[PDB]
Amino acid sequence: KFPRVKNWEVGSITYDTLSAQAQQDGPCTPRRCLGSLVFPPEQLLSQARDFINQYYSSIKRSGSQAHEQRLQEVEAEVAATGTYQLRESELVFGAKQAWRNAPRCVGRIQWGKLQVFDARDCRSAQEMFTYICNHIKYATNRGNLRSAITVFPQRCPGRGDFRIWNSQLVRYAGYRQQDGSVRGDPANVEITELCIQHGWTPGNGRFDVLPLLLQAPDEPPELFLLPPELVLEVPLEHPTLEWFAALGLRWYALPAVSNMLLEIGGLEFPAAPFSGWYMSTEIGTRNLCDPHRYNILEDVAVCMDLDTRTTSSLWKDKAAVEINVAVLHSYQLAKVTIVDHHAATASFMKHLENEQKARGGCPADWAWIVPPISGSLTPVFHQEMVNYFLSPAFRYQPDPW
Amino acid sequence: FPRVKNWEVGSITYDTLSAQAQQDGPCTPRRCLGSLVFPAPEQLLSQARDFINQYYSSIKRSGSQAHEQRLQEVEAEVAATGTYQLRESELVFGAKQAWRNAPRCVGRIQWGKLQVFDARDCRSAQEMFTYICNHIKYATNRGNLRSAITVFPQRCPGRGDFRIWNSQLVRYAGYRQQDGSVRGDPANVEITELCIQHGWTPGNGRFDVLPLLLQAPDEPPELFLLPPELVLEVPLEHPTLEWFAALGLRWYALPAVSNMLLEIGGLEFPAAPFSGWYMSTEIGTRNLCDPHRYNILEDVAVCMDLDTRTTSSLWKDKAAVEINVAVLHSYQLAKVTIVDHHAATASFMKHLENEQKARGGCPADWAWIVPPISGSLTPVFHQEMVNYFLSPAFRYQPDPW
Numbered sequence: 020k021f022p023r024v025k026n027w028e029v030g031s032i033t034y035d036t037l038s039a040q041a042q043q044d045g046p047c048t049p050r051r052c053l054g055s056l057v058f059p060p061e062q063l064l065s066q067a068r069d070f071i072n073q074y075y076s077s078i079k080r081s082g083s084q085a086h087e088q089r090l091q092e093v094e095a096e097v098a099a100t101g102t103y104q105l106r107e108s109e110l111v112f113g114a115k116q117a118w119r120n121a122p123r124c125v126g127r128i129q130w131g132k133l134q135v136f137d138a139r140d141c142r143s144a145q146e147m148f149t150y151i152c153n154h155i156k157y158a159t160n161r162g163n164l165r166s167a168i169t170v171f172p173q174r175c176p177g178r179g180d181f182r183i184w185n186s187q188l189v190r191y192a193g194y195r196q197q198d199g200s201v202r203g204d205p206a207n208v209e210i211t212e213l214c215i216q217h218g219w220t221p222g223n224g225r226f227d228v229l230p231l232l233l234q235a236p237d238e239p240p241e242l243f244l245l246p247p248e249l250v251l252e253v254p255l256e257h258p259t260l261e262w263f264a265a266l267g268l269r270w271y272a273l274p275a276v277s278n279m280l281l282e283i284g285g286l287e288f289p290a291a292p293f294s295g296w297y298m299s300t301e302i303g304t305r306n307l308c309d310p311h312r313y314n315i316l317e318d319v320a321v322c323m324d325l326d327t328r329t330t331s332s333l334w335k336d337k338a339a340v341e342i343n344v345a346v347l348h349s350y351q352l353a354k355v356t357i358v359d360h361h362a363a364t365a366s367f368m369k370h371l372e373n374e375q376k377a378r379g380g381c382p383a384d385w386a387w388i389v390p391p392i393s394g395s396l397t398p399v400f401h402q403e404m405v406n407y408f409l410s411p412a413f414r415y416q417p418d419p420w
Numbered sequence: 421f422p423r424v425k426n427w428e429v430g431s432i433t434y435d436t437l438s439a440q441a442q443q444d445g446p447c448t449p450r451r452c453l454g455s456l457v458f459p460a461p462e463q464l465l466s467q468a469r470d471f472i473n474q475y476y477s478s479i480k481r482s483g484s485q486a487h488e489q490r491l492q493e494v495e496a497e498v499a500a501t502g503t504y505q506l507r508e509s510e511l512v513f514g515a516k517q518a519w520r521n522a523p524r525c526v527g528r529i530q531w532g533k534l535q536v537f538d539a540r541d542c543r544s545a546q547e548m549f550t551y552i553c554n555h556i557k558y559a560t561n562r563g564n565l566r567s568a569i570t571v572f573p574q575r576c577p578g579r580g581d582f583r584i585w586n587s588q589l590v591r592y593a594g595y596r597q598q599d600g601s602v603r604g605d606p607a608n609v610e611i612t613e614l615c616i617q618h619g620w621t622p623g624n625g626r627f628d629v630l631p632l633l634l635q636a637p638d639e640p641p642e643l644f645l646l647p648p649e650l651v652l653e654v655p656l657e658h659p660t661l662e663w664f665a666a667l668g669l670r671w672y673a674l675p676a677v678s679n680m681l682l683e684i685g686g687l688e689f690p691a692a693p694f695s696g697w698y699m700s701t702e703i704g705t706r707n708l709c710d711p712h713r714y715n716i717l718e719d720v721a722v723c724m725d726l727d728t729r730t731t732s733s734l735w736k737d738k739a740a741v742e743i744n745v746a747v748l749h750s751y752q753l754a755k756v757t758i759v760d761h762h763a764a765t766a767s768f769m770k771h772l773e774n775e776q777k778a779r780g781g782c783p784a785d786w787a788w789i790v791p792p793i794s795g796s797l798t799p800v801f802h803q804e805m806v807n808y809f810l811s812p813a814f815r816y817q818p819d820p821w
């Protein structure tokens with residue numbers, strides 16, 4: 020009844036007893052597996068209890084005076100108001116736990132080092148922008164990146180919500196042409212048209228930092244031009260392919276996701292942007308080489324004079340590796356925090372053993388932990404994993420349009 | 421009906437074939453176990469009833485004379501003997517469906533072109549050896565490889581099973597060492613011990629072809645040396661790194677899997693070895709670079725003058741790419757069929773399109789289909805997949821020891 024889980028590189032075996040606690044049913048059934056699909060009223064009370072119980076057991080304080088009392092005041096809070104507010108330390112506990120529970124995040128060896136900015140006393144877009152701009156600058160820290168989340172007011176019935184309209188705080192533009200095809204990032208063509216709608220003027224670049232679209236409850240969104248000095252960027256150069264710089268590639272320093280809904284102990288925070296630091300394959304492999312993203316693979320290969328006329332020359336593999344080298348090298352020369360997939364995955368194996376000893380397992384989504392180049396060269400490839408939903412959690416949510 | 425998206429292009433289909441999935445796999449809504457490597461007359465009737473129904477849809481004779489006759493026959497044969505016998509064309513179809521249905525096979529574009537050798541009259545291990553030698557000879561075809569399966573007598577009440585104890589027809593020995601290490605392939609230490617225990621004289625090279633351990637019903641397994649000239653091998657060299665030839669590396673031409681069970685209509689064929697041709701990544705990445713296999717990565721990288729002291733130089737990825745290049749070039753030098761992971765994944769995308777029109781879906785195991793290097797450089801990375809079990813099928817079975 021406890022999944023047997025093997026490591027094929029060493030032969031070791033563990034049991035994931037933590038999977039017993041899974042709550043939100045996944046998409047898989049004994050009949051078919053859907054593990055590769057990307058996006059597959061007083062219920063509040065039961066979610067509330069077991070979160071508080073988590074908090075106190077986490078601090079060796081279960082069955083103790085403050086535990087009894089905190090259970091009453093939440094029960095009393097919901098009685099009158101039909102909802103409740105979190106104690107600051109609890110919001111700190113939920114934020115770090117929701118990170119710890121993220122099955123697809125390969126960087127959770129860092130889950131206990133998280134700076135939480137409480138932004139619950141907020142109203143109007145001009146306020147968020149200041150909260151956002153304090154996060155970004157705190158998080159960037161002149162390239163010495165530091166993990167941070169900012170949590171905006173929770174969801175209330177009978178009132179709009181706080182939402183950021185960009186998938187991330189930093190996004191590059193996506194412009195069509197007299198032939199449809201995109202100049203700039205084709206990922207963000209939909210939000211580029213929403214911004215140009217809301218006043219912004221299109222640049223002509225492949226790396227134009229998009230303006231934020233911030234939306235306060237029931238008031239229509241507001242454009243915001245981010246300060247240029249607050250958007251740290253790293254021009255991409257290769258250590259030994261002098262022509263690489265002339266290709267003119269850049270990526271921003273801060274991966275800061277602003278469209279996921281933080282759920283802690285029953286409450287759902289639709290605006291809660293978190294950030295950390297990049298893994299190099301995220302930029303060098305997915306963002307620049309995906310056929311529907313920047314899709315630079317062929318252009319780098321021509322410049323390295325590789326034979327693009329036969330797929331068996333592995334020219335794709337050769338140029339991809341070098342695009343990744345140029346990312347790691349450009350970020351290191353810029354002194355911005357970045358991690359390569361070999362270092363990241365090995366630390367995740369450490370994280371798994373940490374979590375086995377502490378909690379009897381760890382939800383992990385194999386197809387997202389394994390890197391998108393050189394998979395079987397990393398030890399996560401040879402590690403069987405179990406995937407499920409623990410709470411508190413980061414969740415996806417509808418786009419606010 | 422599971423909705424499946426291709427993310428590179430944007431397409432959406434619905435896998436309706438999955439609603440027919442028979443035997444249940446490892447996952448529940450509580451937890452996905454997709455990444456695990458290893459997940460009464462009345463029911464032999466329902467299984468065979470379904471297979472016969474399949475065979476007759478395929479010949480466009482669904483609901484006819486022969487169709488009800490064959491059903492009436494099979495229920496008469498089960499009542500009288502407890503089993504029944506496949507007709508030869510039924511056996512050819514069942515074996516081609518089994519390949520088609522195999523979710524972890526990327527080579528299934530070719531499922532219709534399969535040469536089925538009927539050895540269900542085999543009477544001993546010695547005769548079993550002769551069918552196998554013939555199989556290897558036909559399939560090797562002097563390097564112009566052909567896809568083949570030999571089918572030995574089915575499991576039956578009263579007598580034991582035919583078994584090939586070897587996991588493949590062609591395997592390299594793995595001898596343990598004085599310092600605990602292994603010379604040869606460490607995946608084959610166990611079978612190697614058995615061959616010696618059964619009177620084989622071991623060598624001491626790294627690429628020693630193992631003998632065959634063949635088990636007739638209620639017999640000890642019998643040893644058989646494969647004739648040297650029957651096993652085509654390929655010395656490994658690199659197009660440009662001329663020191664590579666000095667590693668002394670070889671692989672064999674024919675991938676011939678011999679430890680799986682073929683199930684057709686509830687009948688079980690515990691010995692039915694099958695073979696096609698290699699994808700270069702199985703050899704270059706897994707067999708040669710896995711830390712628990714030949715583990716040549718570090719030794720290639722030193723020789724390449726790569727910086728092996730930091731992982732951020734991506735020495736592993738660079739060395740592994742040249743190992744794959746070497747495999748492809750060597751097999752083309754020797755005029756031995758081989759397919760690289762870009763061509764193989766591109767033809768698999770075609771298979772999913774063929775199969776969506778023909779059957780409304782295709783059972784696919786994402787983590788096995790995506791190559792172990794260059795994952796997102798291939799179109800299958802960006803394609804969501806539905807994994808499930810269809811019959812006829814190749815199944816795993818315990819080792820007979």
Ligand code: HEM
Pocket residue numbers: 114118121123124125126129133166167168279293294295296297298301358363387413
């Ligand atoms: C500090 C360094 C970090 C690294 C290197 C890292 C790495 C990654 C990577 C590579 C992914 C895959 C995303 C994709 O490919 O689309 C991911 C997903 C995720 N990360 Fe982390 N991360 C870090 C910090 C954080 C922090 C601070 C949080 C929140 C507090 C977080 C929460 C998440 C979540 C919820 C996901 C899943 C989102 C999704 O499934 O789309 N990560 N992470």
Ligand code: HEM
Pocket residue numbers: 515519522524525526527528530534567568569694695696697698699702759764788814
């Ligand atoms: C003709 C070219 C073929 C190619 C390129 C190919 C490719 C592959 C690859 C790369 C794998 C994963 C192997 C591994 O990771 O160890 C695989 C698995 C498999 N192949 Fe194919 N194959 C071919 C022919 C065949 C044939 C002729 C059959 C049977 C008639 C077959 C049946 C299977 C099965 C049953 C599996 C999965 C076994 C398992 O689950 O471990 N293949 N194939």
Ligand SMILES: CNCc1cc(F)cc(-c2cc(C)cc(N)n2)c1
Pocket residue numbers: 186274275276278279293294295296297298301
């Ligand atoms: C909205 N999808 C979630 C997402 C998408 C994505 F492309 C990247 C990341 C991500 C986040 C953090 C904190 C670090 C990191 N290295 N990556 C998260």
Ligand SMILES: CNCc1cc(F)cc(-c2cc(C)cc(N)n2)c1
Pocket residue numbers: 675676677679680694695696697698699702
């Ligand atoms: C029981 N393990 C199944 C297995 C293991 C394995 F290592 C390799 C292959 C395989 C088989 C064929 C016909 C072609 C090919 N290229 N690979 C199959």
Ligand SMILES: C[C@H](O)[C@H](O)[C@H]1CNc2nc(N)[nH]c(=O)c2N1
Pocket residue numbers: 054055056057386387388427801802803804805
């Ligand atoms: C369909 C497939 O599951 C999809 O492309 C996934 C695979 N694994 C991934 N892993 C990460 N980290 N990010 C992704 O976007 C994806 N895409």
Ligand SMILES: C[C@H](O)[C@H](O)[C@H]1CNc2nc(N)[nH]c(=O)c2N1
Pocket residue numbers: 027400401402403404455456457787788789
């Ligand atoms: C545990 C992990 O699932 C295991 O190493 C798998 C991963 N995917 C694989 N995929 C293929 N095609 N072949 C394999 O041998 C493996 N090994």
Ligand SMILES: [Cl-]
Pocket residue numbers: 274301306
């Ligand atoms: Cl990103």
Ligand SMILES: [Cl-]
Pocket residue numbers: 675702707
């Ligand atoms: Cl093999």
Ligand SMILES: [Gd+3]
Pocket residue numbers: none
């Ligand atoms: Gd020139």
Ligand SMILES: [Gd+3]
Pocket residue numbers: 660661662
């Ligand atoms: Gd030279």
Ligand SMILES: [Zn+2]
Pocket residue numbers: 047051052053054447451452453454
């Ligand atoms: Zn699953």
